[PDB]
Symmetry: C3
Subunit: 335 residues, 3 copies
């Protein structure tokens, strides 16, 4: 009977090992000793995708933490999967990830993984389909459940804002800013320790609206998705890419913390190659140097052998080209 | 086939015996002879809950009208139940209630029983989940079906507005006022005889925004849900409670009619007792004294043996502590 | 797969499968073809695709009968939201593809009509068969516009059949709100295919265009809809002058400035099959509305070429004409010559 459906519960914080909260201070993330912190890690696939082939298991997190140098895993929660498993079940699996990550001393970014224009509720593909109501309810449920959990560090409100050339609606920063502020307010009402992560347009590439109209809330960070072909100089060299990246997103790191929550590449004739992820490989060192110099955090897309661009070519973790490259970067940074 | 689905029908007003319309005049409800009317009664449970145990029957209304002194029953229509039964079936059951109530000379308050913040479509619990679209459609359908029906006196638009400490959204009176005004316009386009009942924030406790920004429509009343622990005076007496009640909701009764559409208590150590309904029993006399001196209408929550605070222990109507108290209040008021 | 991550991205209609057929465009108050010649849409509604499928009447032979024997150059498809949901987008679009091929084979054009009745801003409607949301409406037009990019056969996107608040029982009718919402739909459509013709309707069931004099839709290439059923205008004395004047006041004036399509019109006898206000008439309306539209150069699609939905143009699927059917058949055959 519907009147017997129970009220929800909160994650048991006493079940966790000691782990520092991460906080925002100025343009930096800091730990609870005030030391500058950067998120460095990978995306994995949606929980439901992983479960379907029995790959949702602690051993995945152990591989990443022990052999790939990560301190962070981004979970791209697809709305269609949230519905298919159902909130109750999906949250039970996120609980597993919290325990696994906490045991390894690594952090999670929870990403509401839609692509499109939330104010008109139009999207790139049905797997990303959602509504304002459902998006708010997702964040309400997450915020309540993971109150006071240091492991869950960042709430990435809406993966990739885009109107696809205004075919989805009229992109309007004021409208999107207001909606983000509304989501932030629901979260902060419930847990002030979490870091909301806000994205710009052009699939989370273009932060330039914040130069004059930044989100008017404290404690937030900005996302950036600097895939190789987002910037399109004729002469492909460091100086030209840096000029273009500076203008569209890199400038943000001067004032706010930035997480490049997707980045990566595959050869133009490789597996799952498509605009804007095609590159000859020179992008790898370029984006890493750029982020290193600016102190930008990152999670590579994607530690999965099916979804592209892949970091691994099979579930024995055989590295792809970009996987081998980023593996060494992250291991060296962990050292 | 969908193109053969019929258009809706209106309730047959000739099926009813004579019963006065209730109307709003200034700060009072009145009947069709101008006599001041006070709604005094109870909530019963959602229709679907009652049907599930075969307790949706005229006998329930007879018990209340004959033995408990009520002149009003409030029906808390839960959105999840509206969906589960479906509109067509649920309306057929409301039609039964209308006939039963009319035959007994009592009135109905129809309550769209949600708890949360309709402008952001976020709620306390999924049983209350709704949308602006579904809420409008509920009122559209009700207004059409029950046109010119005196028995159905009050349309209580949204039971308990709350943002749960702004976890559901940012409470904003202007926005809420505007949405109620939109709903009222839909209703009044269809039936100007009905009384809309509008609620404030803090679970329909706080009407204070209306001091400066009242709903800009005539013929409405305001809800109040003055549970015992809503007001929290350090020193618990008539003076301090009356002052706090005055400030947040009682003042409204100076200017508009007010229905306390939920009130009641359970002893603090009682099975199932919770904030804000815990009380040592002194609230009963105090809230009744306050309401009586201000001429405030009321429907006790709840005449059900399961849903708390209960007025009865079982379906033989054994009164609970608050049940026994309010029964004697209502029987005495009916004789006055 | 039954796996959601394997669901393909959508595809566009194969424009190479089509015979040559001119695009129709808007220029001033006229429709024109690709030679610059003034074009007039003249044809009929048929029923919703799902209704027709249910009895195996969604057939090429229906389009052939109309094009070959009834003088039409246009068919309007009234896509009901409940049917969109019942068949599902993917399947419904596959059936629209059939219509595109049929119409192109015959050299005739389609008007695609998102066939709801009510007030989209509040998402409240006349009947559940018309029920929709802003989200679903936008998505319909997004999908349609993508699929039929660069397809001349598909000429007009009729955004929302019949705006009405039913005496403000559905919401407060408000031109500014409605204008803005139509502009929003147009922007999404134009971002995907600038060649299409959006068709915008006013209140009172797509009858009152008068608000456009000072508050027209602020986009180029727009046509306006009117549904001038016989009892919409109510002159005290029934004669040509009084009907023409009332028609010009509420909608016909629009044709002086913009192209207009009367996407529903027609009548039945007051004691006839399915008779109801506002479609009852003794027949004098037929010559009147045709004379008026021909003077103004107004395009039209009669409601409806179906034996079940009323007012009918035919009594059976052998195409035996009803009173209005025979009348309009003669008019359209003469106009085609
Ligand atoms: O079935 C089609 C195709 O799917 C490919 O995997 C997809 C990923 O490439 C895709 O990654 C994108 C992110 O979701 C976006 O946020 C970002 O804009 O772009 C990323 C790179 O495209 O994710 C989806 C799931 O969201 C995957 O389905 C397969 O690799 C490929 O084999 C297959 O043909
Ligand atoms: O299943 C949990 C619990 O349900 C209890 O019954 C509930 C009622 O107590 C509850 O009453 C509330 C009103 O609906 C609200 O408007 C008001 O704010 O607060 C009232 C409580 O003080 O109603 C719900 C249905 O809406 C009932 O489920 C049972 O009493 C209890 O035994 C059971 O464990
Ligand atoms: O089942 C009831 C009744 O349905 C009739 O068919 C309906 C059509 O008459 C109706 O046409 C209307 C248009 O849809 C509207 O846009 C316009 O305002 O009014 C038209 C009528 O004047 O369409 C619906 C589908 O939308 C049909 O169901 C049958 O003709 C009748 O026999 C039957 O009893
Ligand atoms: Cl519970
Ligand atoms: Cl576990
Ligand atoms: Cl964009
Ligand atoms: Cl803040
Ligand atoms: Cl009876
Ligand atoms: Cl509140
Ligand atoms: Cl406020
Ligand atoms: Cl008024
Ligand atoms: Cl109207
Ligand atoms: Cl207006
Ligand atoms: Cl334009
Ligand atoms: Cl009629
Ligand atoms: Mg946390
Ligand atoms: Mg484009
Ligand atoms: Mg009434
Ligand atoms: Mg008894
Ligand atoms: Mg076209
Ligand atoms: Na579009």
């Amino acid at each position: 009977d519907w009147w017997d459906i129970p009220y929800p519960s909160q994650f048991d914080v006493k079940s966790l090992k000691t782990q520092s909260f991460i906080s925002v201070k100025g343009n930096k993330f800091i730990d609870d000793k005030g030391k500058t912190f950067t998120f460095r890690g990978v995306n994995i696939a949606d929980t439901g995708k992983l479960l379907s082939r029995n790959q949702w298991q602690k051993s995945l997190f152990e591989e990443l933490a022990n052999n790939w140098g990560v301190n962070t895993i981004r979970l791209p929660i697809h709305p269609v999967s949230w519905r298919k498993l159902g909130p109750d079940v999906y949250l039970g699996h996120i609980d597993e990830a919290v325990r696994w990550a906490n045991d390894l001393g690594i952090y999670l970014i929870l990403d509401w993984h839609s692509i499109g224009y939330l104010p008109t509720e139009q999207y790139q593909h049905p797997m990303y389909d959602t509504t304002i109501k459902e998006t708010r309810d997702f964040w309400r449920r997450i915020t309540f459940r993971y109150q006071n959990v240091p492991t869950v560090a960042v709430y990435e409100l809406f993966n990739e804002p885009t109107t696809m050339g205004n075919t989805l609606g009229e992109r309007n920063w004021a409208e999107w800013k207001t909606l983000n502020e509304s989501l932030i307010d629901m979260i902060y009402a419930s847990d002030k320790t979490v870091i909301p992560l806000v994205a710009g347009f052009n699939w989370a590439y273009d932060l330039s609206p914040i130069k004059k109209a930044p989100i008017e809330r404290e404690g937030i960070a900005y996302a950036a998705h600097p895939y190789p072909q987002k910037a399109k100089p004729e002469v492909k060299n460091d100086k030209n890419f840096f000029k273009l990246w500076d203008e569209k997103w890199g400038f943000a790191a001067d004032t706010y913390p930035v997480i490049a929550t997707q980045l990566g590449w595959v050869q133009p004739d490789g597996y799952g190659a498509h605009i804007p992820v095609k590159d000859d490989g020179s992008y790898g060192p370029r984006i890493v140097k750029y982020m290193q110099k600016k102190g930008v955090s990152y999670t590579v897309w994607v530690f999965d052998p099916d979804w592209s661009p892949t970091m691994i070519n099979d579930w024995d973790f055989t590295p792809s080209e970009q996987g081998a490259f980023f593996k060494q970067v992250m291991l060296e940074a962990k050292k």
